[PDB]
Amino acid sequence: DMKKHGLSIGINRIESVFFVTLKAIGTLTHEDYLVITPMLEGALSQVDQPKVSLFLDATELDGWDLRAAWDDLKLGLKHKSEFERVAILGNKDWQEWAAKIGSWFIAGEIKYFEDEDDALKWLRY
Amino acid sequence: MKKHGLSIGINRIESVFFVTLKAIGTLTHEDYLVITPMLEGALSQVDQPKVSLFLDATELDGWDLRAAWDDLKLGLKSEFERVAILGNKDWQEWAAKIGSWFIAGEIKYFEDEDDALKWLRY
């Protein structure tokens, strides 16, 4: 009834360093892809930092439909830059998107976490 | 490891899409220069003809008054029906100020999330 579904993209500064943030939540549909991804793309294309990394909060993501457009989503940076690091935060138990959601990104390194503090420390230092 | 910044999104509750924006920490002029182009890039892609905005300012401490944040105007390509601002502080500190970034039929301040969201989808 009140369950939320979708994603948000942002920029956060932590200890003087800016990073891109992404939060995915609920169960994503085809309609959701059509409505939400142009906005994510529009946002990410305006990020122009010397080096930049990404924090992906997927703790509240259920997943998406079999072979949905979400499998092939690509989120890239303003001048074809790659993310230095991408920290993917999940939960204790494996979820259907675990081995798939990383492919949205071109990254120097992708690391998976169950604790936000650890994820942020790895990104920052 | 205190976070300072803003995120923008689209969420759906049942069958209704709404724009969502969360602001956190104390925003500086450098933050403005880095975040506002992305915020504007996101908003220019919202095509839904009837749409509202949920603004989560629960973790917002404020911004530098000499920074461009005071003057920010966010909009659609073309207006929000409703903007629901969620926060804990006396409204006169920042709620009216951040509310003024938007043009909308109605702009309302809430301390309860459930009530804010219900009001947006009515």
Author numbering:
A (entry chain A): 2 to 126
B (entry chain B): 3 to 79, 82 to 126
Anything the authors wrote about it?
The YP_749275.1 gene from Shewanella frigidimarina encodes a protein of unknown function with a molecular weight of 14 502 Da (residues 1–126) and a calculated isoelectric point of 4.9. The final model of YP_749275.1 consists of a protein dimer (residues 2–126 for chain A and residues 3–79 and 82–126 for chain B), six ethylene glycols and 224 water molecules in the asymmetric unit. In the ‘closed’ structure (YP_749275.1), the helices partially unfold and rearrange, occluding the cavity and decreasing the solvent-exposed hydrophobic surface. In contrast, in YP_749275.1, α-helices α2 and α3 are substantially shortened (from four and five to one and 2–3 helical turns, respectively) and α3 is rotated by ∼90° from its orientation in YP_001095227.1. In addition, α3 shifts by ∼5 Å towards α2 and thus eliminates the cavity. Residues from α2 (Trp71, Leu74 and Leu78) and α3 [Trp98, Val102 (Ile in YP_749275.1), Trp105 and Phe106], which are exposed to solvent in YP_001095227.1, relocate into the protein interior. For example, in the ‘closed’ state, Trp71 is buried from the solvent and participates in multiple van der Waals interactions with surrounding aromatic and aliphatic residues (Leu8, Leu29, Tyr34, Leu74 and Trp65), while His6 and His31 face the solvent and are not involved in any stabilizing hydrogen bonds. Arg14 of one subunit hydrogen bonds to Asp33 of the other subunit, which is likely to provide some stability and specificity to the dimer formation (YP_749275.1). The lack of conservation of this serine in YP_749275.1 indicates a possible loss of functional similarity to SpoIIAA.
